[PDB]
Amino acid sequence: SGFRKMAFPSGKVEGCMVQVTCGTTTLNGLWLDDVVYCPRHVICTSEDMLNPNYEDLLIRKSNHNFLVQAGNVQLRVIGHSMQNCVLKLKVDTANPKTPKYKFVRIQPGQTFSVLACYNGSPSGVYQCAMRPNFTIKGSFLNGSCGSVGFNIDYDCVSFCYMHHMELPTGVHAGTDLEGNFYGPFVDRQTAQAAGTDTTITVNVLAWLYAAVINGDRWFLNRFTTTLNDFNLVAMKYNYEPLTQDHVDILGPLSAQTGIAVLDMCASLKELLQNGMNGRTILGSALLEDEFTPFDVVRQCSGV
Amino acid sequence: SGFRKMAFPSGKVEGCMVQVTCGTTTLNGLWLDDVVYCPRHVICTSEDMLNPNYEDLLIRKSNHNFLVQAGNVQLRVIGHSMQNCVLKLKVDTANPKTPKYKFVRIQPGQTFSVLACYNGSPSGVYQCAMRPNFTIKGSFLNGSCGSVGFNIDYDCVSFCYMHHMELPTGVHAGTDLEGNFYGPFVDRQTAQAAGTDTTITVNVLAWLYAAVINGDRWFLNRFTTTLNDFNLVAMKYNYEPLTQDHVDILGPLSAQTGIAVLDMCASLKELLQNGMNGRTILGSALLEDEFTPFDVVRQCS
Numbered sequence: 001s002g003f004r005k006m007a008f009p010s011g012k013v014e015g016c017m018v019q020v021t022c023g024t025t026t027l028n029g030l031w032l033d034d035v036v037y038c039p040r041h042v043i044c045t046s047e048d049m050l051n052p053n054y055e056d057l058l059i060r061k062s063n064h065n066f067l068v069q070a071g072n073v074q075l076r077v078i079g080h081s082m083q084n085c086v087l088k089l090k091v092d093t094a095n096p097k098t099p100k101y102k103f104v105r106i107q108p109g110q111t112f113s114v115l116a117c118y119n120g121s122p123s124g125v126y127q128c129a130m131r132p133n134f135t136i137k138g139s140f141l142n143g144s145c146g147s148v149g150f151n152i153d154y155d156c157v158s159f160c161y162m163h164h165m166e167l168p169t170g171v172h173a174g175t176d177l178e179g180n181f182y183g184p185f186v187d188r189q190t191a192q193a194a195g196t197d198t199t200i201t202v203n204v205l206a207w208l209y210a211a212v213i214n215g216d217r218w219f220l221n222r223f224t225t226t227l228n229d230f231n232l233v234a235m236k237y238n239y240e241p242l243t244q245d246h247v248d249i250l251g252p253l254s255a256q257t258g259i260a261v262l263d264m265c266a267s268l269k270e271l272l273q274n275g276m277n278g279r280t281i282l283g284s285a286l287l288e289d290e291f292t293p294f295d296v297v298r299q300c301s302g303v
Numbered sequence: 304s305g306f307r308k309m310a311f312p313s314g315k316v317e318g319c320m321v322q323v324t325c326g327t328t329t330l331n332g333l334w335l336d337d338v339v340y341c342p343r344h345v346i347c348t349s350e351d352m353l354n355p356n357y358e359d360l361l362i363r364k365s366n367h368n369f370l371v372q373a374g375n376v377q378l379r380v381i382g383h384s385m386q387n388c389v390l391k392l393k394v395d396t397a398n399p400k401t402p403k404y405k406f407v408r409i410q411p412g413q414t415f416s417v418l419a420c421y422n423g424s425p426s427g428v429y430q431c432a433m434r435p436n437f438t439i440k441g442s443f444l445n446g447s448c449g450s451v452g453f454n455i456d457y458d459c460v461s462f463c464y465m466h467h468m469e470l471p472t473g474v475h476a477g478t479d480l481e482g483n484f485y486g487p488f489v490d491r492q493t494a495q496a497a498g499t500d501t502t503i504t505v506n507v508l509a510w511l512y513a514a515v516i517n518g519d520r521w522f523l524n525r526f527t528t529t530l531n532d533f534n535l536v537a538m539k540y541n542y543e544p545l546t547q548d549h550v551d552i553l554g555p556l557s558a559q560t561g562i563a564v565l566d567m568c569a570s571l572k573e574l575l576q577n578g579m580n581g582r583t584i585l586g587s588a589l590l591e592d593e594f595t596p597f598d599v600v601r602q603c604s
């Protein structure tokens with residue numbers, strides 16, 4: 001029993017984190033085989049950061065301008081190149097701890113674990129979701145840039161996020177490992193803002209299914225509803241539309257609990273309309289939307 | 304900025320988790336140097352659990368009755384002994400991945416990371432506190448027993464918890480790594496029940512100091528309180544007493560924010576009286592009590 005915001009074990013990723021220094025900028029890099037991946041902004045100064053021309057700044061640098069430290073050991077950079085907003089530093093040593101891995105791009109609503117690091121040294125792990133507005137609600141200070149997000153899908157690490165920046169509202173923006181930003185953000189100091197966010201409906205329902213599995217049942221009712229009527233209600237409360245695809249994905253949890261998705265939607269309707277009336281669900285007074293259906297099945301049945 | 308329930312990186316502990324089997328019972332063990340630590344109830348059957356006599360069950364076992372598996376590899380058990388409610392299995396190979404570590408017994412209110420495991424293989428990592436009633440609110444299924452709690456300050460892993468059992472209310476009980484239970488719990492399936500829980504007042508205050516640090520001030524007020532009047536009110540909402548020790552511990556966060564501990568206490572009183580009126584603090588609609596003063600200084604600024 002019990003239901004907790006749970007990260008993947010971070011050990012396979014810990015053994016890939018290095019420190020990358022360029023001039024006075026120090027930040028974190030990801031060492032896989034003989035390449036170190038990090039945010040290209042490592043090459044910028046303050047002034048540069050206002051309106052950087054990355055191509056131009058990069059061509060001015062030698063390999064030996066990049067100092068890469070794996071624990072105590074320096075790695076020799078033998079090559080450098082850019083892909084979108086990430087810098088790829090070729091090094092002379094392949095990482096002996098390289099796990100089986102892929103680079104994947106995740107969709108808004110999907111969750112991942114973040115290993116937060118400072119000076120190439122991992123300090124913390126937490127669970128996040130990609131918000132509909134393509135930000136993440138992370139916990140990051142100066143020095144965190146180049147920290148990464150991942151899922152573990154078997155023994156295979158799927159890298160999905162690299163941290164680049166904080167927005168003025170204190171949320172976080174970054175790229176996939178091919179250097180493409182999530183969201184309409186750029187790596188320069190101009191005015192940027194998170195767009196207005198929405199609640200991830202399918203995740204809230206998943207968490208309601210988790211609560212029932214853990215014995216928390218007071219919000220169930222005798223009512224059912226249609227997709228359309230529900231979606232009318234979702235839109236009103238700044239919830240994402242729910243699709244048939246979502247309904248399909250919740251199938252397992254529906255079968256296990258005997259609550260049809262549209263039945264559970266009737267529950268969520270009521271919560272949105274009436275509130276919680278002083279009650280909690282799994283110890284929360286708000287509806288949690290950072291657990292996927294997969295997350296719930298993984299934690300409430302298996303390893 | 305941001306504020307998250309954040310666990311320690313789990314890799315130093317992952318390299319220590321093994322599977323321990325006795326008869327038909329399989330659970331998790333912790334391999335440090337040439338010893339594997341696990342719950343002694345691994346030697347119990349169906350019948351045993353009501354009134355097990357561990358000494359009598361154990362004397363009947365040989366080394367080779369204990370199967371220990373580290374990933375693919377079997378370890379040879381060359382010794383066994385019991386300490387309190389943990390079994391120590393001596394093995395023929397020292398764990399080459401053994402981190403620098405110590406065993407520490409924690410007080411209620413302290414937080415730690417849990418690495419949940421099944422079959423000696425890690426499943427997830429999350430953050431917990433020792434509740435005042437000596438339980439933890441974990442996430443644990445059958446087979447999780449022998450999973451461990453830890454902190455990593457510096458490069459040294461401090462092991463503080465091993466999981467033994469689930470109580471009827473769905474909360475969790477276990478031991479330090481010397482096999483002493485937290486609280487009055489025993490490794491017998493008799494009727495035992497968690498004491499009524501209280502909120503960890505010092506932690507809530509710490510978290511209010513965190514919300515100030517991250518720019519959030521709406522809950523402050525112009526009032527102060529005595530320690531004693533604070534405690535008289537706190538107890539009526541099932542909050543733990545706050546001691547002078549707690550006040551001393553909050554000193555640094557007081558200095559950093561310019562808000563005296565008893566002024567923050569005044570704020571908490573009002574929050575308890577009023578609730579939040581549709582507002583949140585660091586993204587919560589409840590008062591969070593699973594971040595220590597140390598945790599707040601670690602994560603913030």
Ligand SMILES: O=C(NCc1cccnc1)N1CCc2c(F)cccc21
Pocket residue numbers: 041140141142143144145164165166167172186187188189190304
């Ligand atoms: O925000 C930061 N860096 C430090 C930091 C602090 C806390 C959390 N994350 C990151 N940066 C660097 C790069 C950058 C831009 F290009 C555009 C806006 C912001 C930023």
Ligand SMILES: O=C(NCc1cccnc1)N1CCc2c(F)cccc21
Pocket residue numbers: 001344443444445446447448467468469470489490491492493
């Ligand atoms: O409850 C369990 N084991 C299963 C379990 C389930 C969910 C989470 N953790 C563990 N046990 C084993 C040992 C024991 C006692 F001695 C006294 C009461 C209970 C238990």
Ligand code: NA
Pocket residue numbers: 220221222223224262263264266267
């Ligand atoms: Na219903």
